[PDB]
């Protein structure tokens, strides 16, 4: 008696309303979402009348004095055959469904005007919701999400916003022993998406049930920040998420640098080729007492005469990487800086990798130390994976967070 499309909707709503992740709708959430859909408290007499009917007609419908999914589906299947579809339709409407039982576009994509220069970040409520969601689908409570848990989480979505195996497990911090996405990495992946694709973030937040939980549009999950002068306003809006473009020639070792941002032990990335092309890596660092998220975009390696796109040049901080063991490697960095960054307002940091081996001379006309000295740049940062030092990442974020 229940439509296959209607059942799909009622299932998602059950998962959203299951705030304990125990496959049950206890008294609390039943009353809470009652005001979400009907703006009235659920009077105790009705709830008893509801449970009694479910218990009477449906086995395994009431477990531990709580409504199960099998009983929840029956109740609305009973509502439609008793001439009260408006009760069911009031619930479907609140969780973002229209007359065609499809997610409303105005419910998924609310209008958000982003001024030039402004960035998109997660708000306090947006973070809290994502934290709440995380700990619900962390059934075993190991403080991390398994690929089985990560699938259930986005079962209320058409698909996952990212691959578990080829994205979040390689672009975000994970648990060292289990190899699963921690709470920290969870917030990192959402922070990355929110900055580069806010519309997708809000679209997925609606699917996860942010609108119903927060009793507001997903605009409350997005916090728009921008770099402003010495404004004496009481409402601070300083940035906390910066993006760094990592540009270098082939074999520069800049890829291994990006991945090292995510692991405490970099002694396992020394002699390793990367089979997966991770575009954006992200982690947080402490900058003067404040938490700052840094995104290390691995710009696609090309020839030295090949042009760089404006959207590849324009960033918060440019990290030009060359190989110290390759005499013909620094010439790319010198070529790139002069053409694209020499006359820009973007802070640039030159990094020499693989300094563990003997730093051979560069077959260029100027040496890296002299080149930086000529264009008033900081001395070339010697980076190595055998050292496990992470001052570079903290430095990069600081250059993006501060003048010039």
Ligand X SMILES: N[C@@H](CCO)C(=O)O
135 binds Na ion (CB under 5 A): no
Q: Is 225 annotated as a binding residue?
A: no
Return the number of the residue (172 or 333) whose C-beta is nearest Ca ion: 172
Under a CB-based contact definition with an 8 Å cutoff, are residues 129 and 201 in contact?
A: no
Q: Mask of contacts with Ca ion, 120-139, x by CB under 5 A?
A: ------------------x-
Query: Side-chain half-sphere of 258: how many Cα atoms within 13 Å?
Result: 30
Which residues within the stretch 53-92 sit at the binding site for ligand X (CB under 6 A)?
A: 75, 91
**Using CB under 5 A as the criterion, what x/- string covers residues 6-25 for binding Na ion?**
------------x-x-x-x-
Angle at 150 between CA 144 and CA 153, to 5 degrees: 115
CA angle 94, 149, 162 (to 5 degrees): 75
27: partner contacted, choices Ca ion, Na ion, ligand X, none (Cβ within 5-8 A by kind): none
Q: Considering the complex, state which of residue 152 and residue 301 has its C-beta at the smaller distance from Ca ion.
A: 152
- Residue 22 in marked binding region: yes
Q: Which of residues 36-55 bind ligand X (CB under 6 A)?
A: 37, 50
Q: How far is the CB of 141 from Ca ion (least distance, A)?
A: 7
Q: From the CB of 89, what's the least distance to ligand X, in Å?
A: 11
Alpha carbon distances (Å) from 199 to 56, 60, 157, 230, 270: 46, 40, 15, 30, 38
Contact 396, 319 (CB under 8 A): yes
Q: Return the percent helix, strand and coil in the chain, to nearest 5.
A: 40, 15, 45
Question: How many CA atoms within 13 Å lie on the side-chain side of 338?
Answer: 9
- Asked if residue 198 lies in contact with residue 120, where contact means CB atoms within 8 angstroms, the answer is yes
The encoded tokens of residue 334 equal: 């010198």
CB of 44 to ligand X, least distance (A): 13
Rule CB under 5 A: say whether 298 interacts with Na ion.
no
Query: Quick one: what does residue 140 bind among Na ion, Ca ion, ligand X, none, with the CB cut-off 5 to 8 Å set by partner type?
Result: Ca ion
Q: What is the DSSP string of 77-95?
A: HHHTTTT-HHHHHHHHHHT
Considering the complex, state which of residue 138 and residue 167 has its C-beta at the smaller distance from Ca ion. 138
Three-state DSSP state, 217: coil
**Interface of this chain with ligand X, residues 88 to 147, rule: CB under 6 A:** 91
In this chain, which of 15, 16, 33, 400 binds ligand X, going by CB under 6 A?
Answer: 33
Q: How far is the CB of 183 from Ca ion (least distance, A)?
A: 10
- Assess 322 for contact with ligand X (CB under 6 A): no
Nearest C-alpha neighbor of 332 from the set 230, 252, 267, 276: 252
- Give the interface with Na ion as residue ranges (CB under 5 A): 18, 20, 22, 24
Binding site residues for GTP, as ranges? 248-255, 286-290, 353-356
- Give the interface with Ca ion as residue ranges (CB under 5 A): 138, 140, 142, 149
- Give the interface with ligand X as residue ranges (CB under 6 A): 17, 30, 33-34, 37, 50, 75, 91
């Amino acid at each position: 008696e229940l439509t296959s499309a209607c059942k799909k909707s009622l299932v998602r709503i059950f998962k959203i309303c299951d705030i304990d992740g125990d496959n049950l709708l206890n008294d609390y959430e039943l009353n809470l979402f009652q005001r979400r859909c009907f703006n009235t408290p659920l009077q105790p007499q009705i709830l008893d009348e509801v449970k009694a009917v479910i218990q009477k007609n449906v086995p395994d419908g009431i477990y531990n004095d709580a409504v199960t999914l099998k009983g929840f589906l029956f109740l609305h299947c009973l509502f439609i055959q008793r001439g009260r579809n408006e009760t069911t339709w009031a619930v479907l409407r609140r969780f973002g469904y229209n007359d065609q039982l499809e997610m409303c576009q105005e419910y998924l994509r609310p209008p958000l005007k982003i001024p030039p220069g402004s960035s998109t970040e997660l708000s306090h409520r947006g973070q809290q919701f994502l934290i709440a969601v995380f700990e619900r689908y962390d059934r075993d409570g190991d403080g991390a999400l398994s690929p089985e848990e990560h699938k259930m989480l986005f079962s209320t979505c058409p698909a996952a916003p990212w691959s578990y195996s080829t994205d979040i497990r390689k672009s975000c911090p994970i648990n060292e022993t289990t190899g699963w996405v921690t709470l920290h990495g969870w917030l990192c992946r959402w922070t990355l998406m929110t900055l580069i694709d806010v519309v997708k973030t809000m679209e997925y937040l609606a699917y996860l049930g942010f609108n119903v939980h927060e009793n507001d549009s997903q605009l409350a999950a997005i916090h728009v920040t921008r770099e402003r002068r010495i404004d004496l306003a009481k409402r601070q809006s300083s940035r906390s998420v910066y993006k760094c473009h990592v540009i270098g020639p082939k074999g520069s070792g800049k890829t291994g640098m990006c991945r090292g941002f995510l692991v405490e032990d970099m002694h396992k990335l020394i002699g390793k080729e990367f089979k997966t092309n991770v575009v954006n890596c992200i982690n947080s660092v402490q900058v003067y007492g404040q938490e700052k998220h840094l995104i290390l975009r691995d710009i696609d390696v090309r020839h030295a005469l090949d042009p760089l796109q404006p959207q590849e040049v324009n960033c918060d901080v440019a990290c030009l990487v060359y190989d110290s063991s390759n005499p013909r490697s620094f010439e790319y960095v010198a070529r790139i800086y002069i053409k694209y960054y020499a006359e820009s307002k973007i802070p640039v940091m030159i990094v020499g990798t693989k300094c563990d081996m003997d730093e051979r001379r560069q077959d260029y006309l100027m040496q890296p130390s002299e080149f930086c000295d000529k264009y008033k740049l900081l001395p070339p940062h010697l980076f190595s994976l055998k050292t496990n030092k992470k001052e570079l990442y903290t430095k990069l974020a600081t250059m993006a967070a501060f003048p010039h």
